[PDB]
C-alpha cells in the first residue's frame, strides 16, 4: 500500500476557519451559544440571518463536493 489534509494544503482550513469566524460573528450579532454557532458552522462544513446561513450552507456544500472530487482525484 495524509492525503485528506494535503488536498486542503492547510490553507483551506484556516480560510474556512476565519470565514466561519466572521460568519459566526455576524450570526452572533444577528457563551455556549457561540460554541453552538461554531458547532453549526462546522456542522455545515461536514454537511451534517436565515439567508446568510442558507448561502453559507450552499457554499459549504459546493466546497464539500469540490473537496471530495479533488481528494478522490489526488488520491
Amino acid at each position: 500500500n495524509s492525503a485528506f489534509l494535503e488536498p486542503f494544503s492547510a490553507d483551506v482550513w484556516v480560510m474556512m476557519f476565519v470565514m466561519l469566524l466572521i460568519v459566526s460573528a455576524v450570526a452572533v450579532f444577528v457563551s455556549f451559544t457561540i460554541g453552538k454557532a461554531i458547532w453549526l458552522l462546522w456542522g455545515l462544513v461536514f454537511n451534517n440571518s436565515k439567508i446568510m446561513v442558507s448561502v453559507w450552507a450552499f457554499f459549504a456544500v459546493i466546497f464539500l463536493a469540490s473537496y471530495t472530487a479533488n481528494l478522490a482525484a489526488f488520491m
Binding site: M19, I22, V23, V26, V30, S49, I51, M52, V55, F59
Partner: peptide, 21 residues
Amino acid sequence: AGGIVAGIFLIFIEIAYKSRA
C-alpha cells in the same frame, strides 16, 4: 467576505424594510 458584507447589507436593508412596514 464580500458576499458576507453585502449579505449583511442586504439583511440590513431587508430588516429596515420590515421595520418600516
